[PDB]
From a paper:
Each leukotoxin is made up of two subunits of approximately 30 kDa: a host cell targeting S-component (HlgA, HlgC, [name], lukS-PV, and LukA/G), and a polymerization F- component (HlgB, LukD, lukF-PV, and LukB/H), which can bind the plasma membrane through highly conserved phosphocholine binding sites.
Residues 34–43, and residues 39–46 are visible for the 1st and 2nd peptide, respectively. The first peptide interacts with site 1 through its sTyr41 residue in a manner similar to the pCS molecule. The preceding residues 36FPDGD40 close the back of the binding pocket, decreasing the solvent exposed surface area of sTyr41, and provide additional stability through multiple intermolecular interactions. Asp38 forms a salt bridge with [name] Arg290, and Gly39 carbonyl oxygen is hydrogen bonded to Arg101 from site 2. The 2nd peptide sTyr41 residue interacts with site 2, in a way that is also similar to pCS, although Arg101 sidechain adopts a different conformation and an additional salt bridge is formed between the sulfate and Lys283. Other stabilizing interactions include several backbone-backbone hydrogen bonds between Asp40-Lys92, Gly42-Asp90, and Leu45-Phe88, and hydrophobic interactions between Leu45 and Phe88, Ala219 and Arg220 of [name]. Although the conformation of both peptides is stabilized by multiple interactions with [name], it should be noted that the 2nd peptide chain runs with its C-terminus going away from the putative location of the membrane.
Residue numbers in the entry:
A (entry chain M): 34 to 43
B (entry chain B): 39 to 46
C (entry chain A): 30 to 309
Amino acid sequence: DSFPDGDYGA
Amino acid sequence: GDYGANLE
Amino acid sequence: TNIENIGDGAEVIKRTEDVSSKKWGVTQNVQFDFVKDKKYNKDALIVKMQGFINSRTSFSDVKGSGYELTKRMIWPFQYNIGLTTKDPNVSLINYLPKNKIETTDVGQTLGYNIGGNFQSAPSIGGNGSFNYSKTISYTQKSYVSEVDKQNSKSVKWGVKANEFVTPDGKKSAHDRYLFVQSPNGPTGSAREYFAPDNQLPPLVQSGFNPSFITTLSHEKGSSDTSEFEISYGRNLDITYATLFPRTGIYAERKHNAFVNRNFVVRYEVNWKTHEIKVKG
């Protein structure tokens, strides 16, 4: 939730 | 996946 | 609610909105000051954009065969701040900063005098000649501020990486080895392949606290409301560092790796009631 969709690729 | 978890 | 008499029959009606996004790592803390002056044929709304944009700096392993000794650092090459409108009844009549500024500290003032007279100075403290004034103040160590776009309907600033103090002297923001270092040993940790926090300036380590102004102009008697959007965000680069036991640390940069990672908020101004609402 505190990050964009995909979380930079994580 | 392509990358490990994001470290601060 | 917050009304200031500014002399000669004029007043300023002050509104604020605070809108954040934990997803985008942004807080927009915006001040909207309506200039209500019978001697000016237009309504004016001084919009001061403050808040916070997280750097979103991170460090991680790169998975897959051949990438076991490759690590990455994601970091903000530029902070994006902009305000745009498509409403025919509103135009932008000034913006601050108005020009490129490369000093670590930025401090400027917008002044208003009765009769629709705006003036800007790239300093704070100059003269007590204005009926009303608003200032901007921010720090951008190693970064520079540019006006990426400016016209009657939109303004966009970019606060962009420029030159960094490094143990081996000054390094350009385009140096592929910027922030790269040899780790102590082969014992993992993506973090160890990059410069420690004490070598990273605030815009890389933490984030940016914007402070920008633009004034919206509206003909009195045109429609009661206007919509506009404020966008805060960043463009991120990636620096990859690969450890080669016999030839050392090898670095590559993916420039503009994630562009326009922005939080956009749509606002509505009601010129008749002197109110601001967030649309979403």
